[PDB]
Symmetry: C2
Subunit: 257 residues, 2 copies
Amino acid sequence: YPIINFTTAGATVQSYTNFIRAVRGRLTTGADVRHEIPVLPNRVGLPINQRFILVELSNHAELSVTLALDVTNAYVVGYRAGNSAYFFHPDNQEDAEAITHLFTDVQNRYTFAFGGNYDRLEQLAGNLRENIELGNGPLEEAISALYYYSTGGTQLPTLARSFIICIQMISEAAHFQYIEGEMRTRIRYNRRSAPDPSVITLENSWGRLSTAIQESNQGAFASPIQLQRRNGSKFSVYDVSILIPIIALMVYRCAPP
Amino acid sequence: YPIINFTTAGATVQSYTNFIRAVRGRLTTGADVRHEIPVLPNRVGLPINQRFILVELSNHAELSVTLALDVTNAYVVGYRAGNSAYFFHPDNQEDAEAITHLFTDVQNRYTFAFGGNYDRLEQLAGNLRENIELGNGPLEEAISALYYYSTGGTQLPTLARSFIICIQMISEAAHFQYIEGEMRTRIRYNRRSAPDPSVITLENSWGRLSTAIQESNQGAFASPIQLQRRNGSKFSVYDVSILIPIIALMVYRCAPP
């Protein structure tokens, strides 16, 4: 599968922007764009040889980990670190067979009992997204924790906290130019801070925004979607127009009429 | 006031496109654009010295006529031909005082009793838009009829038929890239043919489309506007997006939120 490399060591806003630009280009084919937003490949009919891309991450401690992203949703399905590969609990048999193709050369393969969704991972982390720091230092630490899980050095709540960091900084940055923008600011000023309400409500709403946009009547939504602004106030979305500089990729929901 | 010159003599699709491009540029200031469509100047607060532009038309018979267009709606308010100026019945006192500034140097000034709206003009022409030809030959003839009205050579039904031609080919072409497109096809193949239902329903709906777009909730209309297609079938518009390659200029209806 293609591999995109990224290191937190000496990361700048441009090396992070290049990286997310590369991920997005690997994820989308250009064949399906609706209202100027790219749609991800439809899962039905997609060959296994085109199902995943790998993101290889290194940190200043010269430790590496390779995450496997699912091309149909850009979410992380599992990872390897040296000798071992770990996969989230497959949602169905199709995905169970698909993941057999990843990291085939690792000696030890584990599939966790829990799935990679934010509700599961927050219960396990013992903390919500609203209280977990994001930034380059958070991501630097995440890479060592994921790596040392192999050698028994990382406890499960840390493994889950570290997954929450990697998924928002790679998968959600790729899903939203807005969330990518938030991560660039953190690196510009080397700040580390939990996500405000606009970030979390966009993350929660990605599936619904994808469906409302593809089901729209010429761009007008049949019913509004409430989002939150950085200060927590509500904001109603009525039309795809205002989302065009905010969402970067939609999950496939229906054929273009 | 600015004058744009145009002659039907040897007109090509490019000399007609240049002409309508020039009119549109004279009409709009670039200061107010909503959903990528330019809005015409608001009438309240607009100085008389910026209220009108003049379009000078000549034909192969080397006869000329100068129409005065109102910048707030791009509709024709009156015209001169040699010795005389003729103005439509002013809609109110403000417009009555405004037109005193036009063609001040003509010896004879007449203001008609009827107004320049399509309902009036069709009653007077004894024919509807659906049965009046449009094209370069129609426009060539319109210019001679408007001119000879001065010398008593043009009867009133012909004067009205000729006004219906000039307003759709200048004012409506400027209002709609779609109607401009229809006129370019007529000149490309030197066809002369009455307007199909899409042209007439756009002409009738220009005011409502302007208000629905400016009153929209992020581009979504609160209630749909039915238009007709060339073959007469109905078509519902729900969103400004689909109108963006169709309408070129909107009349001012409200301040941008």
